[PDB]
């Protein structure tokens, strides 16, 4: 059912994430960590310490699809156990290095052909798909877009509702 989704995502801000290769996703979904570039890591931050929810909605380049959608369960982090990314061309370890703990909510995919009726206004009502790292999707884009994700049987809500 719907209700248990609808309760995580009420007062939910949300962020388009673009990742470059598929391997930092799939660490991501097994570790739940997520780091960002430093612009989107202050905007994460600002965004954590605000709203009831952070809702991360993950999209690898070029792969026509959504990876699934995560919520931030800390502000980001220095000093931590050091995060295996493998790091795009003109990427560093120091650039990557405030690790954000998040909670997935559904880790399978969502092609953009079943995204292509929702628009984003906050990004000129372009496609929801469209969009930089880091672009903020508007409330009811967003969790329209999320409840298009199908059931995610390997997640347990428990643990985000319960420290909500």
Not at 59 to 78: P, W
């Given at each position: 059912?719907?209700?248990?989704?609808?309760y995580?995502?009420?007062?939910?801000?949300?962020?388009?994430?673009?990742?470059?290769?598929?391997?930092?996703?799939?660490?991501?979904?097994?570790?739940?960590?997520?780091?960002?570039?430093?612009?989107?890591?202050?905007?994460?931050?600002?965004?954590?310490?605000?709203?009831?929810?952070?809702?991360?909605?993950?999209?690898?380049?070029?792969?026509?699809?959504?990876?699934?959608?995560?919520?931030?369960?800390?502000?980001?982090?220095?000093?931590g156990?050091?995060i295996?990314?493998?790091?795009?061309?003109?990427?560093?370890?120091?650039?990557?290095?405030?690790?954000?703990?998040?909670?997935?909510?559904?880790?399978?995919?969502?092609?953009?052909?079943?995204?292509?009726?929702?628009?984003?206004?906050?990004?000129?009502?372009?496609?929801?798909?469209?969009?930089?790292?880091?672009?903020?999707?508007?409330?009811?884009?967003?969790?329209?877009?999320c409840?298009?994700?199908?059931?995610?049987?390997?997640?347990?809500?428990?643990?985000?509702?319960?420290?909500?």
């Amino acid at each position: 059912g719907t209700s248990k989704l609808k309760y995580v995502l009420q007062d939910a801000r949300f962020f388009l994430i673009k990742s470059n290769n598929h391997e930092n996703v799939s660490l991501a979904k097994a570790k739940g960590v997520w780091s960002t570039l430093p612009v989107n890591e202050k905007k994460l931050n600002l965004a954590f310490r605000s709203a009831r929810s952070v809702i991360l909605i993950f999209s690898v380049r070029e792969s026509g699809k959504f990876q699934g959608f995560a919520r931030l369960s800390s502000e980001s982090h220095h000093g931590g156990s050091p995060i295996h990314w493998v790091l795009p061309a003109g990427m560093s370890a120091k650039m990557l290095g405030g690790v954000f703990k998040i909670d997935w909510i559904c880790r399978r995919e969502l092609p953009f052909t079943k995204s292509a009726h929702l628009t984003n206004p906050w990004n000129e009502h372009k496609p929801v798909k469209i969009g930089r790292d880091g672009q903020e999707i508007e409330l009811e884009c967003g969790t329209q877009l999320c409840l298009l994700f199908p059931p995610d049987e390997s997640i347990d809500l428990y643990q985000v509702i319960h420290k909500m």
